[PDB]
mmCIF file of C-alpha atoms and ligand atoms in Angstrom:
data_model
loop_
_atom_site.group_PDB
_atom_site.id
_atom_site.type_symbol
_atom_site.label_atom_id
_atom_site.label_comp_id
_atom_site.label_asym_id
_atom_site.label_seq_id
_atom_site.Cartn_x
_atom_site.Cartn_y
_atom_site.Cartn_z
ATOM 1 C CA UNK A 1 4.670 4.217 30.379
ATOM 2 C CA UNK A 2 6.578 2.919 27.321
ATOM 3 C CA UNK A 3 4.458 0.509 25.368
ATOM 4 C CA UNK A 4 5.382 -1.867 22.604
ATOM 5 C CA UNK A 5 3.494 -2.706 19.946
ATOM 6 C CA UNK A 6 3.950 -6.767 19.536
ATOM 7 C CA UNK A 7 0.453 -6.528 20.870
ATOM 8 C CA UNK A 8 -2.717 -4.103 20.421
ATOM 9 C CA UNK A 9 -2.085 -1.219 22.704
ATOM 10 C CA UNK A 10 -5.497 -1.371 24.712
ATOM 11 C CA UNK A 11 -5.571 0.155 27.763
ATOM 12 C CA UNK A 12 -8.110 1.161 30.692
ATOM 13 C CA UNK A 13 -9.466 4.413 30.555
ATOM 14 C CA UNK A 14 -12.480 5.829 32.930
ATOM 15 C CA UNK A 15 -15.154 7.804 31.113
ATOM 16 C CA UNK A 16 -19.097 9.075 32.563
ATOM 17 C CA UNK A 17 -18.105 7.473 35.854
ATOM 18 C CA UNK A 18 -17.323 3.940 34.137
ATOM 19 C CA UNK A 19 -14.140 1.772 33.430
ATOM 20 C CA UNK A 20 -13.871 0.195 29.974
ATOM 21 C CA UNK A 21 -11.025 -0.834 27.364
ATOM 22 C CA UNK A 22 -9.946 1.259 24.620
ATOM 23 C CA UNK A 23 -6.913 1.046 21.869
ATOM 24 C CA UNK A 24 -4.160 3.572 21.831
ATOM 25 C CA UNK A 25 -4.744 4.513 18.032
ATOM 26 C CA UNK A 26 -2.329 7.317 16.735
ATOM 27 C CA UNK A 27 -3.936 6.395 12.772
ATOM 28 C CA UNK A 28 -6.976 8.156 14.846
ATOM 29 C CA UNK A 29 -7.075 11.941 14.700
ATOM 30 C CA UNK A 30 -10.681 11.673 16.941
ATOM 31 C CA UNK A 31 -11.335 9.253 19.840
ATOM 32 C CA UNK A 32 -14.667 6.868 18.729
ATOM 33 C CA UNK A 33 -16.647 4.916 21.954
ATOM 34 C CA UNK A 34 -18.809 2.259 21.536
ATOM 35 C CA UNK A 35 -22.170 3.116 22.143
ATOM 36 C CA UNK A 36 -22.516 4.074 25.694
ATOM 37 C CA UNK A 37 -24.466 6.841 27.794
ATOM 38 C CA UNK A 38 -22.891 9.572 28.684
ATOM 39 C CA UNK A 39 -24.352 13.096 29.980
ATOM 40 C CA UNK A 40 -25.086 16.480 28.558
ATOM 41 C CA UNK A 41 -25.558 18.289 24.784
ATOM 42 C CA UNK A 42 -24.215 16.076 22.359
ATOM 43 C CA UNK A 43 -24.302 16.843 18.056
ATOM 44 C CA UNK A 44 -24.316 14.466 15.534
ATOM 45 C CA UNK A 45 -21.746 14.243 13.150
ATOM 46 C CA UNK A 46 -20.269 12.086 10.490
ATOM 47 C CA UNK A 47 -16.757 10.219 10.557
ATOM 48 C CA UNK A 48 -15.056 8.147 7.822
ATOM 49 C CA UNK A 49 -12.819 5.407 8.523
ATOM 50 C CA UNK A 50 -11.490 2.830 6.174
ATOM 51 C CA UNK A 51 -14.512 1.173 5.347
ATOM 52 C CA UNK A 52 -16.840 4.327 5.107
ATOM 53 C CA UNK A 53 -18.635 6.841 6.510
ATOM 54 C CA UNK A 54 -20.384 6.324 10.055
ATOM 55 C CA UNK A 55 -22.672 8.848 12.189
ATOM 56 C CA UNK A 56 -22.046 9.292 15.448
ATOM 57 C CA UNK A 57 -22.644 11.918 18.886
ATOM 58 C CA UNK A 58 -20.206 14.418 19.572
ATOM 59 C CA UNK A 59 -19.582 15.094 23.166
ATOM 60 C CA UNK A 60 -17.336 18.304 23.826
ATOM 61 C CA UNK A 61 -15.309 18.987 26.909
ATOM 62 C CA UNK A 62 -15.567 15.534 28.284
ATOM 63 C CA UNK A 63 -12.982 13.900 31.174
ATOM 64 C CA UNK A 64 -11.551 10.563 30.313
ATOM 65 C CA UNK A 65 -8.325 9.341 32.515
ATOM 66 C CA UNK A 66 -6.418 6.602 30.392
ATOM 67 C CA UNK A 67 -3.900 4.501 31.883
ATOM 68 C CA UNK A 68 -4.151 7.072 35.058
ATOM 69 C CA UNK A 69 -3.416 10.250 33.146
ATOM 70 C CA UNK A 70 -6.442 13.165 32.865
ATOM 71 C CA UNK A 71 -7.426 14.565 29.432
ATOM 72 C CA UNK A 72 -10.627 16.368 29.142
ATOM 73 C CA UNK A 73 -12.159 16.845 25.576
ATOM 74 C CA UNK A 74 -14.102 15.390 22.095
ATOM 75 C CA UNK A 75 -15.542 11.940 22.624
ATOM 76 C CA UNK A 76 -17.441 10.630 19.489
ATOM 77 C CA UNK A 77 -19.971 7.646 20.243
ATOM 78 C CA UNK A 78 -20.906 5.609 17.511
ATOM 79 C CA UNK A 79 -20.856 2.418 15.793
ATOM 80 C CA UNK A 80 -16.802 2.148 15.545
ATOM 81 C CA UNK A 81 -15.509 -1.895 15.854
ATOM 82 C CA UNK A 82 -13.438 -1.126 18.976
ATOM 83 C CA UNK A 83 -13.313 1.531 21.288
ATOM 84 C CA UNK A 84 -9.861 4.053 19.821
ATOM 85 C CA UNK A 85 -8.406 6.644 22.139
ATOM 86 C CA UNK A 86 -7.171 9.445 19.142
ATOM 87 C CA UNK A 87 -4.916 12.129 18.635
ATOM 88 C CA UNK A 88 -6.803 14.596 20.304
ATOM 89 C CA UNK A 89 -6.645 12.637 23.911
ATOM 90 C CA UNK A 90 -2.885 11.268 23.060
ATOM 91 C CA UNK A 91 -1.869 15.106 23.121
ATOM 92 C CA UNK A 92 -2.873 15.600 25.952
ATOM 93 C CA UNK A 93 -1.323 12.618 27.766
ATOM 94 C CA UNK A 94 1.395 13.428 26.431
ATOM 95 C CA UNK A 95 1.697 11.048 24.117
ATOM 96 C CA UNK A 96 4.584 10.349 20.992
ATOM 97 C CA UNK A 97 5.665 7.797 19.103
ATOM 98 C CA UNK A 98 9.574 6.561 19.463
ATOM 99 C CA UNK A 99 11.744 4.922 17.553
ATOM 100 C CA UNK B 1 13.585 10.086 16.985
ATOM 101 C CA UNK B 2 10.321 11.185 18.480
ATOM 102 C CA UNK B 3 6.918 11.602 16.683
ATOM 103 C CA UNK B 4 4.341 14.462 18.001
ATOM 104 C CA UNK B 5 1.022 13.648 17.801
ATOM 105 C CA UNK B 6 0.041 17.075 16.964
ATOM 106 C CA UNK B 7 -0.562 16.488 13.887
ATOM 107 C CA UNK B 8 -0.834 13.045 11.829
ATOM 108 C CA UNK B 9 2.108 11.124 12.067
ATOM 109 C CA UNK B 10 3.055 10.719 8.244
ATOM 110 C CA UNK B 11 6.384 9.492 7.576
ATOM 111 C CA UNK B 12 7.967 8.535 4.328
ATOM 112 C CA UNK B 13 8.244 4.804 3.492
ATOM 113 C CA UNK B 14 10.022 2.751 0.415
ATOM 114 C CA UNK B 15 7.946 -0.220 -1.118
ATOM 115 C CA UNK B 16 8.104 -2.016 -4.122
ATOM 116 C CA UNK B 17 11.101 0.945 -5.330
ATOM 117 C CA UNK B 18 8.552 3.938 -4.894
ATOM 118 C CA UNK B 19 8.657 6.216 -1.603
ATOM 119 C CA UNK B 20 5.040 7.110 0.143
ATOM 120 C CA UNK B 21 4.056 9.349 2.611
ATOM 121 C CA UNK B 22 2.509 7.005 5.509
ATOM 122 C CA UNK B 23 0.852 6.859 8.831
ATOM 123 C CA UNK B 24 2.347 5.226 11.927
ATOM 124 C CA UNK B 25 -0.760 3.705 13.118
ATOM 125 C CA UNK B 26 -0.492 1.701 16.527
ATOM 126 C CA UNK B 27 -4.532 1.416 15.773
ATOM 127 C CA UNK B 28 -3.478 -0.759 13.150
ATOM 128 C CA UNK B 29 -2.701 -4.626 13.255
ATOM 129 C CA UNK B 30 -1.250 -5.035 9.589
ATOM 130 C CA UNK B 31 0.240 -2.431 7.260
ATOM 131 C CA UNK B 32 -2.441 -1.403 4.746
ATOM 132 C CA UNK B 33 -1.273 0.640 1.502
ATOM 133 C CA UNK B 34 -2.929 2.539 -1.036
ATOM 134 C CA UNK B 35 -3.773 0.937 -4.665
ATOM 135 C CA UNK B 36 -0.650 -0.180 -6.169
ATOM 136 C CA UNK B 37 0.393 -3.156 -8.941
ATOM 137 C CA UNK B 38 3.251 -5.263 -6.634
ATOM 138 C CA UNK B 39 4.552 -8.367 -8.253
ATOM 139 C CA UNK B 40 4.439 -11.365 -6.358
ATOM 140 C CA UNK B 41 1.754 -14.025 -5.213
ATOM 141 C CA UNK B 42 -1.173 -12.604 -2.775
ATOM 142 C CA UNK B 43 -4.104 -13.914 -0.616
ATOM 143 C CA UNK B 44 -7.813 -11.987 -0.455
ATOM 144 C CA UNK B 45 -8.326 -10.674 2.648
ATOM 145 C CA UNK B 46 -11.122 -8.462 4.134
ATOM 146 C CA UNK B 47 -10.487 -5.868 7.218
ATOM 147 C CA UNK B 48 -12.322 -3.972 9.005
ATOM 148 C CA UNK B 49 -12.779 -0.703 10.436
ATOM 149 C CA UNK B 50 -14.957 2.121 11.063
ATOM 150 C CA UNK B 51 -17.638 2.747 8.331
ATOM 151 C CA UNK B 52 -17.093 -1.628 7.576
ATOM 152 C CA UNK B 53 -14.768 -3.605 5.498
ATOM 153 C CA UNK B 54 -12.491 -3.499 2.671
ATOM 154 C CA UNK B 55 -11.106 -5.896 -0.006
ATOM 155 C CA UNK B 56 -7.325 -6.205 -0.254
ATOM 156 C CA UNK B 57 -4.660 -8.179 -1.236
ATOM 157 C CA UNK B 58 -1.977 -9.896 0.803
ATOM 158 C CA UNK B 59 1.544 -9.781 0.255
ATOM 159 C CA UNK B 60 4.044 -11.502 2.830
ATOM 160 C CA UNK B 61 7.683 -10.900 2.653
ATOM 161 C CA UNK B 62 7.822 -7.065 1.338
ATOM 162 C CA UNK B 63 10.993 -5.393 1.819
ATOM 163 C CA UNK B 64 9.032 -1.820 3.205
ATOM 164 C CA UNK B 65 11.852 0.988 4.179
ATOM 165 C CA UNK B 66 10.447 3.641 6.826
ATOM 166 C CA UNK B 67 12.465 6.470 7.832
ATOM 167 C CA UNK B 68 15.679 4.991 6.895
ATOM 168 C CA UNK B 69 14.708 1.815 8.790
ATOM 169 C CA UNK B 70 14.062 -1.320 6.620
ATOM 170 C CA UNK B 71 11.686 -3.671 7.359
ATOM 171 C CA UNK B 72 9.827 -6.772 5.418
ATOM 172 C CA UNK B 73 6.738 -8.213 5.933
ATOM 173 C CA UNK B 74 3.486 -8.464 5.357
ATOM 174 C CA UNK B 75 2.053 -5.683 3.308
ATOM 175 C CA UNK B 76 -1.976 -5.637 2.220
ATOM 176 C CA UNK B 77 -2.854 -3.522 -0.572
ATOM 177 C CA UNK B 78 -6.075 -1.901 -1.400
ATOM 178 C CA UNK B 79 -8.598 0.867 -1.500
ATOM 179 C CA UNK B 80 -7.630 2.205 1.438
ATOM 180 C CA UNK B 81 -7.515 6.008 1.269
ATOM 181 C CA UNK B 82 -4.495 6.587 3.130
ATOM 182 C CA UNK B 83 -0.808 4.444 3.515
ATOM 183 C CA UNK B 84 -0.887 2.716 6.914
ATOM 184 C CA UNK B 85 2.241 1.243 8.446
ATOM 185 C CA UNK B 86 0.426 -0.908 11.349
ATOM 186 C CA UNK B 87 1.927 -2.826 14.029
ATOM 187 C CA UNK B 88 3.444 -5.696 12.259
ATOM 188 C CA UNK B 89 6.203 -3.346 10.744
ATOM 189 C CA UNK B 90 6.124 -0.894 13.294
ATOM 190 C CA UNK B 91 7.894 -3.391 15.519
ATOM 191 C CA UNK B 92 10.514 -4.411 13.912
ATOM 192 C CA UNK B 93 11.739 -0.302 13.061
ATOM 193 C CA UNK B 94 11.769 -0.101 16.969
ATOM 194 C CA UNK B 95 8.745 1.743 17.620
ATOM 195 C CA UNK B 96 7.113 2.277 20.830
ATOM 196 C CA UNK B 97 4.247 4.725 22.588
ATOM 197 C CA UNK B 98 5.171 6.796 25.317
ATOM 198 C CA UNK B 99 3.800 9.042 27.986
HETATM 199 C C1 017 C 1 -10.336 1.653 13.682
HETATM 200 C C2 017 C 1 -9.038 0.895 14.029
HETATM 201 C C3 017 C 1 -9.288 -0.208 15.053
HETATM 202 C C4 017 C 1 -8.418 0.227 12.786
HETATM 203 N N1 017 C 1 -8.009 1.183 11.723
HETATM 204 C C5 017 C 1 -6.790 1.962 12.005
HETATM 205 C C6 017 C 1 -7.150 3.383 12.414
HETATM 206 O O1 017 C 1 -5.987 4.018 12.941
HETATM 207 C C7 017 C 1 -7.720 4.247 11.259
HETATM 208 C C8 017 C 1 -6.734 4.613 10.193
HETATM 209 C C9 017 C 1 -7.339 5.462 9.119
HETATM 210 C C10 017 C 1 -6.992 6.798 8.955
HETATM 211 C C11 017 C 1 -7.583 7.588 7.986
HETATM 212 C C12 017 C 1 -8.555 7.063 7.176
HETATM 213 C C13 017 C 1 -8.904 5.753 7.308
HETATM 214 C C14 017 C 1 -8.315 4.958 8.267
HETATM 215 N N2 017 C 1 -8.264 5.494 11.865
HETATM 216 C C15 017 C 1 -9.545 5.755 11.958
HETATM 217 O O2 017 C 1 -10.475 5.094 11.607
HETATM 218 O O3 017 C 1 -9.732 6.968 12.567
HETATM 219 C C16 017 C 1 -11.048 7.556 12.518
HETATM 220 C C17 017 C 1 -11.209 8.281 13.837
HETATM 221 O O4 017 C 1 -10.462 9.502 13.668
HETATM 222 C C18 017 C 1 -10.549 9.894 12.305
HETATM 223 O O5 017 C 1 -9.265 10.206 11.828
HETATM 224 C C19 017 C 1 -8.836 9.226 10.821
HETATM 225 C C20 017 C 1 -10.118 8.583 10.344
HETATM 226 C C21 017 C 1 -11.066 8.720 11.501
HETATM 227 S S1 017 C 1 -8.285 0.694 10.191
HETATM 228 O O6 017 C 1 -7.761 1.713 9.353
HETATM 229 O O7 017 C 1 -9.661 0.399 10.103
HETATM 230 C C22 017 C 1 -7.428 -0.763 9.860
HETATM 231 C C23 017 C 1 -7.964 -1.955 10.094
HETATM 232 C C24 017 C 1 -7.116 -3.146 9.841
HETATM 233 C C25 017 C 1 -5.739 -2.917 9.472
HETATM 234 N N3 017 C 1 -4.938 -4.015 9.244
HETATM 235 C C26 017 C 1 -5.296 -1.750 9.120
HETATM 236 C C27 017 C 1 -6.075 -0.620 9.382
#
């Protein structure tokens, strides 16, 4: 799709078998869930965002279809304020911005 | 012209008669920049991202150039660590996600 930006860009992605809403966030170089389950080896890290420095699980190698397009990689889960679909899931939608 | 997401999507902006190197952030609401002593009236705001919140200071009715395509509106200013053109000027420069 094209999308426009006179509103947030949240779409519905499918992750660990569920549906949820997530923000199209190209300021985002890693994609950041909401806390949530999801199976298999995870590692903790640490991500900084505007406000700081957060801790989170890594999850490698994991499927997530947004807006009905497959991408399979690094999921973070941690205590972000919305769920944010980065640059490493945008590339492989093929995503880019337009003007 | 079209914007990989590759890599981060830094562009060069003009503000206030100095040019910046900033990020196209659809993530973003509001454009967010860096430290920087603007004349003009402003509000206190707080946003809010990952890691918590940060003190800034409103500005409405900036003239912001972005790749050759002007733009005014509402700029915040603070301690963010990197320039963030959000969705409020992204707009009106014609910008749009696409995949
Ligand atoms: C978390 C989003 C809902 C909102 N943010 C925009 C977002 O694009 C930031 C923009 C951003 C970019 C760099 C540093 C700080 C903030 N990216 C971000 O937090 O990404 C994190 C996940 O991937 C990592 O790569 C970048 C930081 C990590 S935000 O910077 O907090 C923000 C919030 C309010 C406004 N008006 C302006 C910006």
């Amino acid at each position: 799709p094209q999308i426009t930006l006179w509103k947030r860009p949240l779409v519905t992605i499918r992750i660990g078998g569920q549906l949820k809403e997530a923000l199209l966030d190209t300021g985002a170089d890693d994609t950041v869930l909401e806390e949530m389950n999801l199976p298999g080896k995870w590692k903790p890290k640490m991500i900084g965002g505007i406000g700081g420095f957060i801790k989170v699980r890594q999850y490698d190698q994991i499927p997530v279809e947004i807006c009905g397009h497959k991408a399979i990689g690094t999921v973070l889960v941690g205590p972000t304020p919305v769920n944010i679909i980065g640059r490493n899931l945008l590339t492989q939608i093929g995503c880019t911005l337009n003007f």
